[PDB]
């Protein structure tokens, strides 16, 4: 642990500075160091961890997609042989992406999930576990691909079960979990009907609970509900 000598509070402070400076790799390294102090994370600290790695892996995914598209075009008929370089470089980016996913999953397994007892923390971490297995599934092609997909499904499903029992239907974590699990169904599991059904039921149940909320909570919930609607519009 390269951050072993830095105070927990200083790591959190620097993660926030790194975010302001749009230095997301630094932000992720600082948050990994904070997690490795062994204490539970607060709600805000969980957000910092998620933002950092979402931005890092999001950039890797975007690059992987660009390279994969070039590689596919290089393998079509009439294409001129350009050597192993496209595959090699796609593989380089892919291996780095897998390394980041493995790091996040490692933090969740050692030992964030097992210490998370409140729904707001446990659902959030299980959602993250589903997300990072989903990113592994996006690039997977080997003997373990079905097991990777099933690991994502299982994490999302445990999060869903807790969220439905312990959170109101407008809770933003519950909504974001459903948003992402719906995307999992559509893009990973080849289950577009399940994706659409989940997004629609989630949206409708949230709508019916908005009446209970303050103006600020309403803003938070409707923001995520709009993402559900956006995906439904894309898919129907």
């Amino acid at each position: 642990g390269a951050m072993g000598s830095m105070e927990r509070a200083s790591l959190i402070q620097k993660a926030k500075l790194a975010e302001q400076a749009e230095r997301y790799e630094d932000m992720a390294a600082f948050m990994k160091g904070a997690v490795e102090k062994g204490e539970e994370l607060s709600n805000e600290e969980r957000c910092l961890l998620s933002v950092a790695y979402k931005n890092v892996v999001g950039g890797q995914r975007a690059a992987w997609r660009v390279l994969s598209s070039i590689e596919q075009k290089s393998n079509e008929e009439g294409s001129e042989e350009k050597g192993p370089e496209v595959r090699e470089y796609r593989e380089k980016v892919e291996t780095e992406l897998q390394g980041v996913c493995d790091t996040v999953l490692g933090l969740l397994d050692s030992h964030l999930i097992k210490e998370a007892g409140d729904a707001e923390s446990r659902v959030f971490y299980l959602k993250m576990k589903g997300d990072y297995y989903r990113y592994l599934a996006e690039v997977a092609t080997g003997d373990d691909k079905k097991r990777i997909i099933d690991s994502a499904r299982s994490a999302y499903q445990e999060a869903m079960d807790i969220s439905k029992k312990e959170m109101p239907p407008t809770n933003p974590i519950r909504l974001g979990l459903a948003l992402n699990f719906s995307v999992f169904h559509y893009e990973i599991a080849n289950s577009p009907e399940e994706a659409i059904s989940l997004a629609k039921t989630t949206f409708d149940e949230a709508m019916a609970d908005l009446h209970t909320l303050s103006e600020d909570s309403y803003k938070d919930s409707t923001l995520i509900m709009q993402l559900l609607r956006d995906n439904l519009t894309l898919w129907t």
Binding site: G176, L179, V183, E187, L227, N231
Partner: peptide, 5 residues
């Protein structure tokens, strides 16, 4: 791509 958070 679809929206995720």
């Amino acid at each position: 791509f679809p929206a995720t958070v």
